[PDB]
Amino acid sequence: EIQVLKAPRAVVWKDFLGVNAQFLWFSPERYNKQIDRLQDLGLEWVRLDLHWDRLETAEDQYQLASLDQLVKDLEARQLKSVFYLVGSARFITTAPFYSPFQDQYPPRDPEVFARRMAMLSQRYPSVAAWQVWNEPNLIGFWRPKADPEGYAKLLQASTIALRMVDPEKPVVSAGMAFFSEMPDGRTMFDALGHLGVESLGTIATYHPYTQLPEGNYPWNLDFVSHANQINRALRNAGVPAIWSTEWGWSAYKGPKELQDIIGVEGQADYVLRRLALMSALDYDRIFLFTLSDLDQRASVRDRDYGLLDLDANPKPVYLALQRFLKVTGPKLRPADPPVTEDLPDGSFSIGWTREDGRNVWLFWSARGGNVRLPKLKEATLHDPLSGKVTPLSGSDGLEVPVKSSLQMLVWE
Ligand SMILES: [Cl-]
Ligand SMILES: [Cl-]
Ligand SMILES: [Cl-]
Ligand code: NA
């Protein structure tokens, strides 16, 4: 089946597309270079992970110097930042004494956590938004079992405390892993909705990782229909906004751990296809995982999600995204695809207009092939993975080659 998408509203990349960042893993010199590369894309939103057991190493004993300096740097570079705090400090963890995962258990008292998020927000008034925990539907962030009621109480205490510091500042709920599914078969969004958590007015967000850009398996590319369903449900619950705070693929060589091996070229291809989908769905903002490759402190797979390598230099995905954003320009308005004949089965098709008024068609199909555009005499085809630019012309319609990877047709 062909999947045509039309976005609900205009997209301004600087407002819409941010990146995750692990700036505290790096020297200031190195993270400022990563920031140079982010600004060269015309982007400014970053999402930073903070781990409570690294910030408060004993009760009321903190390690804030490097975060203090980072916040000043982010403000000086004019980035907009969302910070999330996750994990329990050792003095407050519900972990049993013998657990090797002390910070992966929730706090014994949600108010203690809430006070720390208020202290951070007070200390760092430049931060644009504050996010409460991460992926509480996943065992690795909330042991020993997912607990909707416990997360709801943590989110409520945190939302109250953050709003006391700054009643106007957004409060972002935890990014839910996947589409919020839990091991017990419920979904965290459904369970929190039954608890009335929409009454807190926090931003909703999830991390819809799928093996391929458009779904998990070639015979079931249901990303778009699944995202549409979740997003309509969140809208229907009255959420203020929907973000996706984490999505992406690793270029790692293996061994395979959950994600199939796709390499640097697969990373570039997949990120561009997924971006083309998510920017045409009902998200207010999304954050690619992640700005930089990571060293051996990260898992083998987690080392290679970067736009940038360890030296803060572009990987193929960065160069491809850069070519894509140069073709689109800074702002796209929803539009319709050109009229086609014989578009291949399984194609994806998305139309936009750029700031110069020209049309951009984003399209691909697993089966490749060709498509006829009967009503055009001129258009330019751009392959963002290779940099190839092809002027196409015909007296009676164009023929356009279709690839498994994204291409961009620009036409009047
Ligand atoms: Cl941290
Ligand atoms: Cl896990
Ligand atoms: Cl047309
Ligand atoms: Na297909």
Numbering used by the authors: 31 to 442
Published text:
Psl, a polymeric pentasaccharide composed of mannose, rhamnose, and glucose, is produced during the early stages of biofilm formation, serving as a protective barrier against antibiotics and the immune system. The Psl biosynthesis gene cluster, besides encoding various glycosyltransferases, also includes an endoglycosidase, PslG. Here, we show, by activity-based protein profiling, structural studies on enzyme–inhibitor complexes, and defined substrate processing, that PslG is not, as previously suggested, an endo-β-mannosidase but instead a retaining endo-β-glucosidase. PslG was classified as a CAZY glycoside hydrolase (GH) 39 enzyme based on its amino acid sequence (CAZy) and its 3-D structure had been solved. This GH39 family is made up of retaining glycosidases acting on a variety of substrates including β-glucosides, β-galactosides and β-xylosides.
To this end, we obtained X-ray structures of PslG complexed with pentasaccharidic cyclophellitol 20, the most potent inhibitor. We attempted to cocrystallize 20 with PslG and unexpectedly succeeded using batch crystallization. Crystals formed in an Eppendorf tube containing a mixture of 100 μL PslG (10.7 mg/mL in 20 mM MES, pH 6.0, 50 mM NaCl) and 10 μL 20 (20 mM in water) after incubation at room temperature for 1 day, followed by storage at 4 °C (see Supporting Information for experimental details).These crystals yielded a structure at a resolution of 1.55 Å with 20 reacted with Glu276 (the postulated nucleophile) and with Glu165 (the postulated acid–base) positioned nearby. The −1 to −3 subsite sugars are bound in a cavity in the active site, while the −4 and −5 subsite mannose sugars lie at the exterior face of the protein molecule. Atypically, compared to many oligosaccharide binding sites in glycoside hydrolases, there is just a single aromatic stacking interaction with 20 which is between the reacted cyclophellitol and Phe319. The −2 and −4 subsite sugars form single hydrogen bonds to amino acid side chains (Tyr114 and Gln134 respectively), while the other sugar moieties are tethered by several hydrogen bonding interactions: the epoxide-opened cyclophellitol to Arg331, Asp332 and Asn164, mannose (−3) to Asp133, His81 and Gln134, and the α-1,2-linked mannose (−5) to Asp83 and Arg84. As can be seen, trisaccharidic cyclophellitol 18 and tetrasaccharidic cyclophellitol 19 block ABP 4 labeling after 1 h preincubation at 500 μM to 1 mM final concentration, whereas pentasaccharidic cyclophellitol 20 blocks labeling at 8 μM final concentration. Of these, the pentasaccharidic inhibitor proved by far the most potent in a competitive ABPP comparison. This pentasaccharide motif likely resembles the natural substrate recognized by PslG, in the negative subsites.
